[PDB]
Each structure stands twice: as C-alpha cells, then as structure tokens.
C-alpha cells in the first residue's frame, strides 16, 4: 500500500508535536 | 554568550543510570536498623 | 474496628497555634487541648486548638485543670459556636515523634473518656519549609498484643504509604500504638489573603538607592574583581595537567576564580540594570 | 427456528454455558502453588490475597476444593475477609444460573444468621458477579431485599450486585432506589450507591442525573461518598469525543483534587482508544502541573485507556516518565504500561518493566508485578523468555520474610492473574471487529481502584475472555472435528509444573479447544473431515461447521 | 499524477521528522540531567 504511508506518517507528526511541549512544561516544573 | 550557550548542547549524553543509593545495602540497612530498634 | 485509613482532616489555623505555642516554650514539652468537629468511624476533623498553661518547672505533659477547660470550654460557647474535644497534643522539642511512657498514660486517661481522642505530636524544630512532622498517633491494645492478634484489619491502600522513622521504631510505634495519615483543609479564601499579604514592597523600586553610592559600590566590586580576574589568569594555566578530578579534590583549601567570578558578574548586573531603568521611569512619569 | 432465533442470538446462552462447557472441560491449574503460598499464615492481607487469588485462577470453573480444603484458615480472618469470602464465590460460579442459590443455601441471611453479617451480607454481590449483564430474577430478587434490609452490610452486595447486573441499562427504577440509596448521607453507602449509580447509567449522558450526582457531590462531609460518585460521573459518559468537554473542564477547574481526578477518569472514558489531540494536550498537561498525587496517578493512567488502539506508542513516552521524582507518577507509569500493552507480549514493555522492581518504594515494586502479570498471560516461554524469568521472581519475593506485605501483594495477586482460569481465559479490551469490549474496559478501570477498597478490583471477571474456537452444525449438536496446525509446535507450550517432592505439528483439536490469537493463523482447516466450515475460519469463539 | 503528486509529500514530511526528532532527542536528555540532579 502507499495510501497509508502519508496519513500514518503525519499521524506521528500529531503524536510528535505534543512531546516538546511536554518537556517544555517539565523544564520549568523540575526547576520550581 | 547566548550562542556559546546554545552551542553547549552537544556534550550532554550517556547519563543513563542514576542509582539513588543501592538495593541490597538498603536491605541490610533495614536489617541492622531493625536490630538497633530491636535492642 | 478501624481500617487503617483514618485520614485526619485538620485545618489551616491549628497548625499555626501548634507551632507558636510549641515554639515559644521550646525546651519544655508544652501541650494543650484540641477542640474539633467529630465525624465518623473513618475520618475525624479538628478545626480549633487552645493551649493550656503549665503546672510548674519541669519538662512534662502533666495534668489538666478541668476548671480551666470547663470555663475555657464555656468561653467561646457563649460567643461563637460549640464544638467537641476531639484530641490533645504535646511537643517533643528536638526529638522526632513517638509516645513516651509519660505520654501514653495521659493518653490512656484521654481515650477512656472518648475512644477517639487523638494523641498529636508536633516538633517545630526539625521543620524548615516543607516539614511539620505532625505524626499523630493513638494507642493500640497491649491486650491484643498479648493475644498476638494483628490489629487494625487493613482494607484500603491508604495506611502503609509513609515510611516510619527509626526512632519511633525504637519507641512504641507498632507495639503500643499506630500511625495516622493526614492532609490539610484549604480553601480559596485564605490562600489569596495570605499570598497577596506576605511580602509586598510598597514603593521601593520607585526610588534611586543611594545615588552617590550605587556607582561607588559598583567600583567597590570591580576593584577586587580585577585581582580575582588575575586568579582567572592563574587557574586556567594548570589545565592539560593531572586528571581534573584531582583539580576537584585539590581545590578545597583555596578559592576558585570561576564561581566567585560569575557571582560578582551577576551582582553587578542586577545591581545596575534595576537602578538604571528605575532611574528612567521617573523622568517620564514625573513631568 | 426464526421464532426461536432472537432467543438463540439475543440471550446468547450458547456462548454462556458453552464457554462454561469449555471451562468445565478445560481446566489446567495447580494445588501446589497454593501450597507454596500457604506458608505465610499471619493476620495480614495474606488471607484475602490467597482467597482472591484462587478466585482469580478459578473464574467460572465451579471448583470447590481449593476452598473446601479447609474452614479454619479460610474463616480465620474476619469482618471483611468473610465479606471477600462470600464475594469470591460468584466468580468461581460465574455464568451459571442453577448453582447460585443452592450452594449459597448455607449463606442466606435468614437461615443460619451468625454474628458475621458480611458472610451473609456480600452474597448478592456474588449473584451480581454470576449474572452480570443478565437481567432477570436477579433484578427483582436483588431489588425487593434491597427495599427492606439492614444497613450497608448487605446493601453493599445488593447495591453493587444490582448495578452490576443492571449495568448500562437505564431501567430508571434501579436509578430510583439508587437515589434513595444515594441521599442516605452515609459514608458507607457512598461506596454502595456511588458506583452502581453510574453503572446503570453507562453511556447515558442523562444531564439531570449528572446534575444530581455532581450537585450532590459538593456538600457532603465524607469522602467515600465523594469517591464512588467520582467514578460514577466518569461512567455516565462513554466515548463521546466532544460531548463531555464542558463537564471535563468544569471538574478540572474546581479546587477539589478528587473532583479533578474524577475529571481525569471522565476524560479517560470519553476517549477510549481514541488518539485525540485535545485529550492528549491537557490530559498529559495536568500530569505536569497538579499538586495532588492521586490526580497525577489517574492522569498518567488515562494514557493506555485512551491509547490501547496502538500499543506501539505508550512505551515510547511513558518510559520517559518512569524516571519521575515521585513514585506516584513512577507507579501510574507502570500501570499505564500494564493497561496499554497487556494484550501482547511486548518485549519493549517488558524491557521497561525490568528495572521497575528495583525502586525503593513498595507500591511501585507492587505495580511492577501487576503490570508484569498483565503483560504475559497465556504466554509460555516462546512469545518472550521472561516468563520463567519471572516465575522464579514472584516466588523469590513471596518466599521472603523480610519483604513488604504490600510488595509481595502484587505477587500473590499476580499468581491468580498469571494462571487465570487454567490458561483458558484472557483479557481483551478489543474485539476483532475494531470495536472494544466495554465490560472489560470498565472491568479494568474498576480494577485499578483496589486502593481505597480491596474487593473493588474483584470486579475483573468481565475482563476474562476466551481464546477458543468452537465448531457447530445445528443449534446444539457438537461435531467431531480433528484439524491441525502447521507452524512451530513449541508455540503450543504449556505451564507444566515441575512437581519436586520427532516433533509433531499436527495438533488435533476438538470443539472445546483453546488456541492462541497468534495461533489463529497457523492452523489448518479440516479438508478431509465430514464437517467442513462454510465460514473462513479467522476468529475464535463459536462458528458454523457444515456437515459435508 | 499520483506519482508526481502523492509521492511529493513523503519527500517533505521526512525532513520535519529528521530535525524535530533531533530537537526532541536533545531536549529529553536536557531534562534527564536535571532529573538526575533532582533524584540525587
Ligand atoms: Zn512526648
């Protein structure tokens, strides 16, 4: 298949986006 | 200064295991502590 | 039976009473009464605490004056609202938390009246910010200890969460009494009115901070910062040398220019920028 | 017939008594294991641990010899272990109408009437366990005794059993006596009515009932009444994807950490298996921010419930959070793996669970053993080699005296989890269709809350599911099919206890024959048998097998 | 035009995967060292 090769690969862009925001939160939370 | 801070983020690696104290020495601390409270 | 899941709710003011009266009379084991609001077999609440004056010279839990707890019990009765005597306390000064042989007898006199009186230990000396050491306890039956029957019938994963101190394990701890988990009753209304009311500078940053001596003090750091920078022209020159953990064990007698330097850089920085901007708002705001 | 068809397909008792037939024909257990766990005779949790362990490994098999071995050590502990004892009988007699009243004829509350009102009190609990999702005489017989009884010493069993049997029905009259069970203002009826109050209203979003529940859970002084409703208002909404968000934000906004925790359960149940962004930002965000540890533990234990569709992603993100400063987030991290990847033998997840027992906190050492049990049920040494690496480990931690009771409680629990039903039952939050198994979902979410009620995680029998094909030609007649497989027969490995005081791949299998879901593809169809399947054999369960 | 169109997206998304992955690997170790300082 080729049709899943783009949708399931932007799926991990949505999955990828949250994590830098997460370590962004823990970056201050481990300080305070 | 700030570029010497942003470029200082390439050495941080291989910081794998942060052992708190131990496990078996904690168990022997519980045993000897239990003996000292037993006395 | 109890379920080792008691979860004492207390207060916000009673802890302040405990540290004040337990602190001002520090070397003597001071005490007092706890006038709370009794609820069910599971939980118990104590909202108010009034202390008791001492008997004489001597560190002890002592006795009670039921004249004094009578009229003092009737004192707020005629003014505020009635409550119920739910417990009592004392104050180990520098000890930790347990029940002494003196403490367990006056505990035994107080559980006989109501079975859910509470022995409370405060220790306001081993506390710094996130510490209170309010490990409150209550007796367990030595009769059942002679029976060898294990008490308190754990039905909830709420009791064995905190780990006991070894000094209480030296004392009674689990042979005469039991531990109790607590929390703190907070609201919105008190949190703001302490938060906005603790350290508020009034008009201080709208000043100039000793306008002759701001720059003079700025000299008074830079002048020795020069020779400390000569130490920074001294300490670099023993690199490519013996194994810088040796440069860690070895610098324990004489100061390093590095940390001492970046101290003074920050001090001069925050010293200058604040006076710089605060000098300039007034030129616009004042005409 | 076609008139009898709605009976044949809507009662569905030819999976109930036929998987019960599979349990009475298929039972692979041990007594020697419970003899090894017999050694810890003390008045700790150990009594309830063992008597919930044999109920965990004897689900629906009706085997009364592990209980009928004794009465003194069984009836040694009291006041809730007898409640748990009369609780545990229904999972053993699960899925069978007849042996519900007649074996509990000793345990009627008006025949013997002992000093233990829980031994005669928690019976209707177990009737609800047998006839969960079976609404009949259990409703009215477990309704009229609830009209007139004692206090919450039988009302726990009748209330939880009645909402359990009437789970997700909205019959509105069980909601009525759950209102008068609700407004008792009693801390001990809070557990009785708070959970069933959501159970009968599962997925119903009756906003006036929401208004009654969250309206009532704002002014009471006790917390168990604040806790049964905390899961109930999560349970009233189920898989809505947007329709709860005002309520999620409302519960999250309030200063009550129990209510914010309940908002985390509610956003956990409104996004089941759904990899949504709006859930994963703030659901994980709070897990940073909030100061109570309970809401953090549920906040990280929502991740497998919202992300069990793909188990490939939670070991990538929760491994990052197994090294938190607090053992609460370290604990709910391990249970987040344990609810995420439990359907598979994920080598990465076992790799993450390996150093989790090394932590100096007893309950995260415990939850490492729970997740270590859930990862590898019905998996024998060829899916992953850590099975026998851990069989010595649970025995290693249960045969020590100097370990914690709370630490080894995950081991004695993990035995009945690990050897459950004679290696015939398993967990499945997921059908082959792509649809989830919502009593397994509610059973595992309710299975999380063994904290504040120990037989609360006894509600797990809705998660135990078969892995077995069944051949059939008519409504009733068993065929005699003898098919085989093709691949490596070491996949067909057994527990095989050791009992200390030339390779056939043609596995001939009858109609009550277990088969691994990985082994669903490696089989061979019966090509020379008289019975030949009209259906392409892909799923287990019950299928047609045409006599040709 | 499925060749010149649909395959023209896999060539682009991968570039975001490569460097945002690298930034993530930087930032999680960044947190790691501090987390070791907290536990220690
Ligand atoms: Zn004292």
From Swiss-Prot, chain A:
Entry's localization field: Cytoplasm; Nucleus
Family under the similarity heading: Belongs to the AAA ATPase family.
UniProt function note: Component of the 26S proteasome, a multiprotein complex involved in the ATP-dependent degradation of ubiquitinated proteins. This complex plays a key role in the maintenance of protein homeostasis by removing misfolded or damaged proteins, which could impair cellular functions, and by removing proteins whose functions are no longer required. Therefore, the proteasome participates in numerous cellular processes, including cell cycle progression, apoptosis, or DNA damage repair.
Subunit and partners: Component of the 19S proteasome regulatory particle complex. The 26S proteasome consists of a 20S core particle (CP) and two 19S regulatory subunits (RP). The regulatory particle is made of a lid composed of 9 subunits, a base containing 6 ATPases including PSMC4 and few additional components. Interacts with NR1I3. Interacts with PAAF1. Interacts with TRIM5. Interacts with ZFAND1.
This protein's name: 26S proteasome regulatory subunit 6B
Full-sequence range covered: 39 to 70 of 418
Swiss-Prot record, chain B:
Segment forming the signal sequence: none
Ranges of biased composition (kind: Basic and acidic residues): 15-39
Residue stretches spanning the membrane: none
Disulfide bonds: none
Residue ranges, annotated region (Disordered): 14-39
Subunit structure: Component of the 19S proteasome regulatory particle complex. The 26S proteasome consists of a 20S core particle (CP) and two 19S regulatory subunits (RP). The regulatory particle is made of a lid composed of 9 subunits including PSMD3, a base containing 6 ATPases and few additional components. Interacts with UBQLN1 (via ubiquitin-like domain). Interacts with ERCC6.
Function statement: Component of the 26S proteasome, a multiprotein complex involved in the ATP-dependent degradation of ubiquitinated proteins. This complex plays a key role in the maintenance of protein homeostasis by removing misfolded or damaged proteins, which could impair cellular functions, and by removing proteins whose functions are no longer required. Therefore, the proteasome participates in numerous cellular processes, including cell cycle progression, apoptosis, or DNA damage repair.
Similarity annotation: Belongs to the proteasome subunit S3 family.
Protein name: 26S proteasome non-ATPase regulatory subunit 3
Provenance organism: Homo sapiens (Human)
Residues of the full protein shown: 487 to 525 of 534
From Swiss-Prot, chain C:
Role: Component of the 26S proteasome, a multiprotein complex involved in the ATP-dependent degradation of ubiquitinated proteins. This complex plays a key role in the maintenance of protein homeostasis by removing misfolded or damaged proteins, which could impair cellular functions, and by removing proteins whose functions are no longer required. Therefore, the proteasome participates in numerous cellular processes, including cell cycle progression, apoptosis, or DNA damage repair.
GO biological process: double-strand break repair via homologous recombination; double-strand break repair via nonhomologous end joining; proteasome-mediated ubiquitin-dependent protein catabolic process; protein deubiquitination; protein K63-linked deubiquitination; regulation of proteasomal protein catabolic process; response to ethanol; ubiquitin-dependent protein catabolic process
Positions in coiled-coil regions: none
Annotated motif JAMM motif, positions: 90-103
Sequence positions that bind Zn(2+): 90, 92, 103
Keywords in alphabetical order: DNA damage, DNA repair, Hydrolase, Metal-binding, Metalloprotease, Phosphoprotein, Protease, Proteasome, Ubl conjugation pathway, Zinc
Alphabetized CDD domains for the sequence: MPN_RPN11_CSN5
Record-annotated MPN domain positions: 8-143
Expressed in which tissues: Widely expressed. Highest levels in heart and skeletal muscle.
PROSITE patterns assigned to the protein according to its UniProt record, in alphabetical order: MPN
Enzyme class: hydrolase
Entry-linked InterPro entries: JAMM/MPN+_dom, JAMM_MPN+_peptidase_M67A, MPN, RPN11_C
Modified residues (Phosphothreonine): 243
Name of the molecule in the record: 26S proteasome non-ATPase regulatory subunit 14
Curated annotation (Swiss-Prot), chain E:
Cellular localization per UniProt: Cytoplasm; Nucleus
Task performed by this protein: Component of the 26S proteasome, a multiprotein complex involved in the ATP-dependent degradation of ubiquitinated proteins. This complex plays a key role in the maintenance of protein homeostasis by removing misfolded or damaged proteins, which could impair cellular functions, and by removing proteins whose functions are no longer required. Therefore, the proteasome participates in numerous cellular processes, including cell cycle progression, apoptosis, or DNA damage repair.
Subunit structure: Component of the 19S proteasome regulatory particle complex. The 26S proteasome consists of a 20S core particle (CP) and two 19S regulatory subunits (RP). The regulatory particle is made of a lid composed of 9 subunits, a base containing 6 ATPases including PSMC5 and few additional components. Component of a complex with USP49 and RUVBL1. Interacts with PRPF19. Interacts with TRIM5. Interacts with NDC80. Interacts with PAAF1. Interacts, in vitro, with the thyroid hormone receptor (in a thyroid hormone T3-dependent manner) and with retinoid X receptor (RXR). Interacts with ERCC6.
Protein family according to the UniProt entry: Belongs to the AAA ATPase family.
UniProt name for this protein: 26S proteasome regulatory subunit 8
Taxonomic source organism: Homo sapiens
Covered residues, full protein: 19 to 58 of 406
């Amino acid at each position: 298949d080729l049709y899943s090769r783009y949708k399931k690969l932007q799926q991990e862009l949505e999955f990828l986006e949250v994590q830098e925001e997460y370590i962004k939160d823990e970056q201050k939370n481990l300080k305070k | 200064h700030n570029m010497s801070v942003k470029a200082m983020r390439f050495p941080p690696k291989s910081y794998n295991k942060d052992l708190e104290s131990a496990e078996e020495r904690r168990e022997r601390e519980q045993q000897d502590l239990e003996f000292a409270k037993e006395m | 039976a109890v379920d080792t899941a008691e979860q004492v709710y207390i207060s916000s003011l009673a802890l302040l009473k405990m540290l004040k009266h337990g602190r001002a009379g520090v070397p003597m084991e001071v005490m007092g009464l706890m006038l709370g609001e009794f609820v069910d077999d599971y939980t118990v609440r104590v909202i108010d605490v009034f202390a008791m004056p001492q008997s004489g010279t001597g560190v002890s839990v002592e006795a009670v004056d039921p004249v004094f707890q009578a009229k003092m019990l009737d004192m707020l009765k005629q003014t505020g609202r009635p409550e119920m005597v739910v417990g009592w306390y004392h104050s180990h000064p520098g000890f930790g938390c347990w029940l002494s042989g003196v403490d367990i007898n006056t505990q035994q006199s107080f559980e006989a009246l109501s079975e859910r009186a509470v022995a409370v230990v405060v220790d306001p000396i081993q506390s710094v910010k996130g510490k209170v050491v309010i490990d409150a306890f209550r007796l367990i039956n030595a009769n059942m200890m002679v029976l060898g029957h294990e008490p308190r019938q754990t039905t909830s994963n709420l009791g064995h969460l905190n780990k006991p101190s070894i000094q209480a394990l030296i004392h009674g701890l689990n042979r005469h009494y039991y531990s109790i988990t607590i929390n703190y009753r907070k609201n919105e209304l008190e949190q703001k009115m302490l938060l906005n009311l603790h350290k508020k500078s009034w008009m201080e940053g709208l000043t100039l901070q000793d306008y002759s001596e701001h720059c003079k003090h700025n000299e008074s750091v830079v002048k020795e910062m020069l020779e400390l920078a000569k130490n920074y022209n001294k300490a670099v020159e023993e690199e490519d040398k013996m194994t810088p953990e040796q440069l860690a064990i070895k610098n324990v007698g004489k100061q390093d220019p590095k940390r001492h330097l970046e101290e003074h850089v920050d001090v001069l920085m925050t010293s200058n920028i604040v006076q710089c901007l605060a000098a300039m708002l007034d030129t616009v705001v004042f005409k | 017939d076609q008139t009898l068809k709605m009976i044949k397909i809507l009662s569905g008792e030819m999976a109930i008594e036929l998987h019960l037939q599979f349990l009475i024909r298929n039972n692979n257990t041990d007594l020697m294991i419970l003899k090894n766990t017999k050694d810890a005779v003390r008045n700790s949790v150990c009594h309830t641990a063992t008597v919930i362990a044999n109920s965990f490994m004897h689900c629906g098999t009706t085997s009364d010899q592990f209980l009928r071995d004794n009465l003194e050590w069984l009836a040694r502990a009291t006041n809730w272990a007898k409640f748990t004892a009369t609780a545990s009988l229904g999972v053993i007699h699960k899925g069978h109408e007849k042996e519900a009243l007649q074996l509990m004829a000793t345990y009627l509350p008006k025949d013997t009437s002992p000093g233990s009102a829980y031994q005669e009190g928690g019976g209707l609990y177990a009737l609800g366990l047998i006839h969960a999702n079976h609404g009949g005489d259990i409703i009215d017989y477990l309704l009229n005794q609830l009209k007139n009884a004692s206090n919450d010493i039988v009302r726990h069993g009748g209330s939880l059993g009645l909402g359990l049997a009437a789970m997700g029905t909205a019959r509105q009259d069980v909601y009525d006596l759950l209102k008068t069970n609700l407004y008792q203002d009693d801390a001990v009826t809070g557990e009785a009515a708070g959970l069933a109050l959501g159970l009968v209203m599962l997925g119903s979003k009756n906003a006036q009932a929401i208004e009654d529940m969250v309206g009532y859970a704002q002014e009471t002084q006790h917390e168990k009444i604040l806790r049964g409703l905390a899961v109930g208002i999560a349970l009233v909404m189920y898989g809505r994807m947007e329709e709860a968000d005002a309520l999620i934000e409302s519960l999250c906004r309030d200063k009550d950490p129990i209510l914010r925790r309940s908002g985390m359960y509610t956003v956990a149940m409104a996004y089941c298996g759904s990899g949504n962004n709006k859930a994963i930002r703030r659901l994980l965000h709070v897990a940073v921010s909030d100061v109570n540890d309970d809401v953090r533990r549920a906040a990280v234990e929502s991740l497998g419930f919202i992300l069990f569709r793909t188990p490939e992603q939670c070991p990538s993100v929760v491994s990052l959070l197994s090294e938190s400063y607090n053992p609460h987030v370290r604990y709910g991290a391990a249970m987040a793996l344990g609810i995420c990847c439990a359907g598979t033998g994920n080598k990465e997840a076992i790799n993450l669970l390996e150093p989790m027992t090394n932590d100096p906190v007893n309950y995260v050492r415990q939850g490492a053993l729970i997740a270590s049990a859930l990862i590898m049920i019905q998996q024998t040494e060829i899916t992953c080699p850590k099975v026998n690496q851990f069989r010595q480990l649970y025995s290693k931690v249960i045969n020590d005296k100097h370990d914690d009771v709370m630490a080894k409680f995950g081991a004695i629990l993990a035995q009945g989890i690990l050897d459950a039903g004679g290696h015939n039952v398993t967990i499945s939050l997921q059908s082959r269709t792509g649809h989830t198994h919502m009593p397994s979902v509610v059973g595992v979410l309710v299975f999380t809350q063994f904290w504040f009620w120990f037989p609360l995680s006894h509600f797990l029998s809705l998660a135990y599911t078969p892995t077995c094909v069944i051949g059939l030609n008519k409504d009733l007649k068993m065929p005699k099919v003898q098919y085989k497989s093709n691949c490596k027969p070491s996949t067909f490995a057994y527990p095989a206890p050791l009992e200390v005081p030339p390779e056939p791949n043609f596995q001939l299998l009858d109609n009550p024959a277990r088969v691994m879901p990985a082994q669903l593809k490696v089989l061979t169809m019966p090509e020379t048998c008289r019975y030949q399947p009209f259906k392409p054999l892909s799923i287990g369960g019950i299928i047609i097998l045409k006599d040709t | 035009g499925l060749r010149q169109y649909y395959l023209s997206k896999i060539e682009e998304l991968q570039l975001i995967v490569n460097d945002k992955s690298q930034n993530l690997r930087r930032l999680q170790a960044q947190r790691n060292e501090l987390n070791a300082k907290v536990r220690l």
